[PDB]
Design a protein around this ligand. Sequence first.
Ligand SMILES: [Ca+2]
Ligand SMILES: [Ca+2]
Lengths: 225, 224
Amino acid sequence: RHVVICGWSESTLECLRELRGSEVFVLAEDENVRKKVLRSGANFVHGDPTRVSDLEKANVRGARAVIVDLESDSETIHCILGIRKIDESVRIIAEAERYENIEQLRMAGADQVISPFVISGRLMSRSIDDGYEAMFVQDVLAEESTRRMVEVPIPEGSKLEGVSVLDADIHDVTGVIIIGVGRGDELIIDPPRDYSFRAGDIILGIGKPEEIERLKNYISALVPR
Amino acid sequence: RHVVICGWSESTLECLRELRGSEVFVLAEDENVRKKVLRSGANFVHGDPTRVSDLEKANVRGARAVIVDLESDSETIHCILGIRKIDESVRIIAEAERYENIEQLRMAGADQVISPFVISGRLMSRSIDDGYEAMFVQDVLAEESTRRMVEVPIPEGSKLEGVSVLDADIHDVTGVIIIGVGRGDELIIDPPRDYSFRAGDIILGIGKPEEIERLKNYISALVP
Ligand SMILES: [Ca+2]
Ligand SMILES: [Ca+2]
């Protein structure tokens, strides 16, 4: 199991740091970065992320995911198109440089498009009086963070299958704040009364590590007599 | 009140979208971006963001905050230093596209640094299996969305002065989920039931527009 990164930028550098301990391959046109990629804990492949043969050389086929961030959005689109020819099942995550290009990255094949500047502009507008929201968005997104945002799936046979958020009382049992539930293509915030947890749901929660393990055990199957 | 933006890029373009309604002044060297800044709803000031005289021309003194978004690392620093020569009472928020320059920005006196690529890279690493965490950022930050994150300050004279979060029962009363409370320069995520609110505390919550305005009224002042 392994991850592929197309393009080397400050974003994919940050990405790789977060992937410490996992197998990762980086594909870029600049040979000069090999040493830093290596010390950053990835395997480096010198080549062109828009050319199929090179994406293939970088183990895109059967990758757990491919992360793409080339210098322009048109290069990123071409890489996306090349990846899809190789493997139609592989998850593709793409950074967009300019807002007007977001849908074209999706149309090309990205399962998800991240727009650093859109996120930045939004935080900027929220940071006029203080920095607490940016404090928050940084306090949670980092793996190294103490109290972090985590995803925990509702397993098959869960205690909570068919049970609503109110009956669940997760925050009392576990200490975890439920900030969302990921189901199918949608993320639901503050689920209403008529929401029941279904196996396969992804709980987006915030909590210290021991509160997280508490949640995981809590949502398990009823142990019969 | 008014806000000043030094520089222009995709970041400040999006920023203006969420500031439509505010008086915003954009100061930038590239005359070519006037038309776009104007359509975006800000007033355009042509000039040099590193220069005290042009920063003053852009209404920096007395400004609620200045946002600095310059391609040059060294210019960002000189911009920060120029603002501070004009008015130390201004909140300064600076964008860093290079991690290397963050400490230089703080040394110069930036109050806050935003690093788009740290957030982006972290979101990339959180998105290997699914995109829910990044969806939580698209959904919650776009002020033009259904259920967003809001800062609501506790006004002096608030009904909730000295009132504990358990006793406050905010989520039950208003529908807003409390994520954290900010006091001073610390953000307390998920404050314990016996934490007592104070004027000047900033409640971080997520809710619908009506829940939010419900919370603003709930914590409103006692105005005899
Ligand atoms: Ca990039
Ligand atoms: Ca910038």
